[PDB]
């Protein structure tokens, strides 16, 4: 699988039949159809004790991994029931500033999309959460081109080190709190992973307010390689999956 024409999203259904499931992600968020649910509690993000370990190029993105052997960085409140632990974060960007996001608002697409992945700690490990309908919690944050995001530069500088697939580098003392928008207002719906296995275990929480980043910041992303070292260079761009059918699902708003 990949994002090319011969291994693109439109071919995933052959290896991952679930790609044609009933609760697939991403979806288009129709702000007029979204239903404001008053009984929705405020989001609770506690990343003050977060501990990043490394950054890795897995061939379809770059992952910032965190230490989740303890309730260091947690996500609770909101639509969620219990504690969810931060395991890793990654992005989805385009070839141009006109595309890159997996999620869209009123059919609009952003430069990129930040996804912070959390697993329901009553399941004890990550591997077991994927086996549950409420095993994961995803924080979707949209990125627009404008002013530079200061708290994102550490990441942008290390990319040269993980240019190719398989590469990794130590990445400690990184505070994810520098990547959140001002407001925690969100939309929530039942979904899945936007990459194979495409398991339908995720509880989506897409924040309303986007974070701006500079054109030179987004450009560093696009300099990454899908390919492994010593292989023909295939730039890591357009690593996003097209919106899927909501199929009866309902998208709720906290605002
Ligand atoms: Hg699941
Ligand atoms: Zn993602």
Curated annotation (Swiss-Prot):
Outcome after substituting residue 195 to S: Enhanced p-nitrophenyl acetate esterase activity, but normal CO(2) hydrase activity
Activity modulation: Activated by X-ray, histamine, L-adrenaline, L- and D-phenylalanine, L- and D-histidine, L-His-OMe and beta-Ala-His (carnosine).
Mutagenesis or variant effect for residue 113 to Q: Strongly reduced activity and sulfonamide affinity
GO cellular component, one term: plasma membrane
Post-translational modification Phosphoserine, affected residues: 161, 168
PROSITE patterns (UniProt xref): ALPHA_CA_1, ALPHA_CA_2
pH dependence (record): Optimum pH is 6-8.
Domain Alpha-carbonic anhydrase, residue spans: 1-255
Effect of residue 61 to S: 2-fold decrease in enzyme efficiency, as determined by kcat/KM ratio, and efficiently inhibited by chlorzolamide
Annotated substrate binding sites: 194-195
InterPro entries in UniProt: CA_dom, CA_dom_sf, Carbonic_anhydrase_a-class, Carbonic_anhydrase_a-class_CS
Effect in UniProt of substituting residue 63 to L: Reduced activity
Domain of life: Eukaryota
Stated consequence of mutating residue 115 to D/N/Q: Reduced activity
Residues marked Fine-tunes the proton-transfer properties of H-64 (site): 3, 58, 63
Extra remark: Target of drugs used in treatments against glaucoma disorder and breast cancer.
Family according to the record: Belongs to the alpha-carbonic anhydrase family.
Assembly notes: Interacts with SLC4A4. Interaction with SLC4A7 regulates SLC4A7 transporter activity. Interacts with SLC26A6 isoform 4 (via C-terminus cytoplasmic domain).
Name the record gives this protein: Carbonic anhydrase 2
Source organism per UniProt: Homo sapiens
């Amino acid at each position: 699988w990949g994002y090319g024409k011969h291994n693109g999203p439109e071919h995933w259904h052959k290896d991952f039949p679930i790609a044609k499931g009933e609760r697939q992600s991403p979806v288009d968020i129709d702000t007029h159809t979204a239903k404001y649910d008053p009984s929705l509690k405020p989001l609770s993000v506690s990343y003050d004790q977060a501990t990043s370990l490394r950054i890795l190029n897995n061939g379809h993105a770059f992952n910032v991994e965190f230490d989740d052997s303890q309730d260091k960085a947690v996500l609770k409140g909101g639509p969620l029931d219990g504690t969810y632990r931060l395991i890793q974060f990654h992005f989805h960007w385009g070839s141009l500033d006109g595309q890159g996001s997996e999620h869209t608002v009123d059919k609009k697409k952003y430069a990129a999309e930040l996804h912070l992945v959390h697993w329901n700690t009553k399941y004890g490990d990550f591997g077991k959460a994927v086996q549950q309908p409420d095993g994961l919690a995803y924080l979707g944050i949209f990125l627009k081109v404008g002013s530079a995001k200061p708290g994102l530069q550490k990441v942008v500088d290390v990319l040269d080190s993980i240019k190719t697939k398989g590469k990794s580098a130590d990445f400690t003392n990184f505070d994810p709190r520098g990547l959140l928008p001002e407001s925690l207002d969100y939309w929530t719906y039942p979904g899945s992973l936007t990459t194979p296995p495409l398991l339908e275990c995720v509880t989506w929480i897409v924040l309303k307010e986007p974070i701006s980043v500079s054109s030179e910041q987004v450009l560093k992303f696009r300099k990454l390689n899908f390919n492994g070292e010593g292989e023909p260079e295939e730039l890591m761009v357009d690593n996003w999956r097209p919106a899927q059918p909501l199929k009866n699902r309902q998208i709720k708003a906290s605002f």
